[PDB]
Amino acid sequence: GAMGSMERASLIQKAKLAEQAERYEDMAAFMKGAVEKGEELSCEERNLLSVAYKNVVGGQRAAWRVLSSIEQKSNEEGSEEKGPEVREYREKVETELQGVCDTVLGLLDSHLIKEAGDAESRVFYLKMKGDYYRYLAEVATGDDKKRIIDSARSAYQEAMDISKKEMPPTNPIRLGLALNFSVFHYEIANSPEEAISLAKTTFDEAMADLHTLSEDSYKDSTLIMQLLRDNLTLWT
């Protein structure tokens, strides 16, 4: 694409500069270019990819929520008609958000997932696939909403199955997958009991494995375990 003429290593270097400068759209474009070189991504590079797009879509999701809330208020009884503008602009933001999700899902399908054989890579990418279908589900209101939800579910479930077989219960990728799948259950699938069960079982199995870890690994795992606890506290 636009990044076709830039060296892979230069794209990676510039993604890191973009991160330092908090230029996440640039970072994402650099990492898209790197993926399109066709080589597999290292661990560091996978995390650059995920950071970039998470920040871009995160901003779009926050904006969408603002606009949706305004739109909902406009449609209450007693609200003065303001014309089509709120809907139009929410739709604009929504369409851009869907585009970013489609771009990420496209990179995963062409061809990151199919070349990912190690558990750490494959689970990472399947978690991403679940996440970006979850973002699509957040804004879905039509005939395909069930199918979008099921696509998220299926990706998370495959990641979960691999992670349970191939990773220790304290592995940060495994933990973060479970955190997010739990939120999927609560917020998307209308399954709060499943969400709570998953978060609690994940926490407790991780706590039992902390004894095996170095100081630095312990720090990494306990950080995510605290997020599980934070959600459990929100939900109970």
Partner: peptide
């Protein structure tokens, strides 16, 4: 909103 990573 709940925490995700």
């Amino acid at each position: 909103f709940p925490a995700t990573v």
